[PDB]
């Protein structure tokens, strides 16, 4: 869907934007610190489902650029599997979010939230 | 979920990148230049529909800046319309991505651009 590598770029980006909201919004509710509202958890989960299927579309051949580490593309496999240990997270956070479980819905955001830093780790860019 | 009025702004400028995305790269499909696969459309429109909801609790109170102009918070009535006009029109292309018919696909398709341009229009910096 992209006309140039550009556009891929801001894509991802822009994609990342909004999981990173979606995700880091959760953080005083999952702390204790924002009183949880399990409906309101429950919807804004499948908010982020959404979202934390688009990015990798984004990395296709040819769009290097941005903070995108050429490994991405070198070790393809190895990529897919962040990303698919990281959306099999965001199934196990939509389940704990869809229980209503506030204990539940804290280690699966953290298991989140570790994939999340594991791949920026090894395949996104020093800023 | 914004610390500060500008991650507001970045927010609903990379809700309204992935918008542009998802709806823009039906061009195609609805000028007939690429074919039409009814399940492909339906799975996007159900992306865009999700994205769709997602930029107006960005321009919430305190959120001025960006391209947006000072009139969506003083005329809040005449831009919740807006809004409200450009998501109706949404479930119109969901109806039309469902049933599976190119022709209303496309006549949804292009009343969907409309809504978008008439918000731009009216509460949209120039550029
Ligand atoms: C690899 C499988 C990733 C996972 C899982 C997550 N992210 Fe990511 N992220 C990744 C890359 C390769 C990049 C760089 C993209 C580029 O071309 O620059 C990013 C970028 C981000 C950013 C910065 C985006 C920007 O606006 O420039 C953010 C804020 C970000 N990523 C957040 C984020 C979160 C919250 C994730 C888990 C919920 C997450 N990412 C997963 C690679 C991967
Ligand atoms: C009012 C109800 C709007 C509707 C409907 C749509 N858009 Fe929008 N858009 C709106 C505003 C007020 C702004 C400015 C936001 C800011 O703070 O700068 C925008 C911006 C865009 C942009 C540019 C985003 C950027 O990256 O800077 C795009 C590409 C865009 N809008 C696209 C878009 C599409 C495709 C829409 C219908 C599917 C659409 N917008 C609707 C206000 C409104
Ligand atoms: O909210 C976020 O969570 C992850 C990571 O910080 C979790 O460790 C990330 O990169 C974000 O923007
Ligand atoms: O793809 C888009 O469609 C609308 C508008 O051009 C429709 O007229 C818009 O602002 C986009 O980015």
């Known amino acids: 869907q992209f ?3 550009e556009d891929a770029v801001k894509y991802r980006q822009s994609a990342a934007t909004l999981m990173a909201s979606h995700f880091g919004r ?3 509710v999952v702390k204790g610190q924002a ?3 399990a409906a309101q958890i429950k919807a804004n989960v499948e908010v982020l489902k959404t979202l934390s299927a688009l990015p990798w579309a984004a990395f296709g ?4 650029g941005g903070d995108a580490r050429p490994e991405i593309w070198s070790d393809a496999a190895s990529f897919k599997q962040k990303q698919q240990a990281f959306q099999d997270n965001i199934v196990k956070l939509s389940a704990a979010a869809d229980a209503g ?3 539940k819905l804290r280690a699966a955001f953290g298991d989140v939230g570790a994939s999340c830093k ?3 780790d090894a395949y ?3 800023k």
């Open 3 to 5: 006309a140039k590598p």
């Open 26 to 28: 959760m953080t005083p």
């Open 35 to 37: 009183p949880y509202d």
């Open 61 to 64: 051949p040819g769009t290097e």
């Open 101 to 103: 479980d506030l204990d």
């Open 118 to 120: 594991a791949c920026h």
């Open 124 to 126: 996104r860019k020093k």
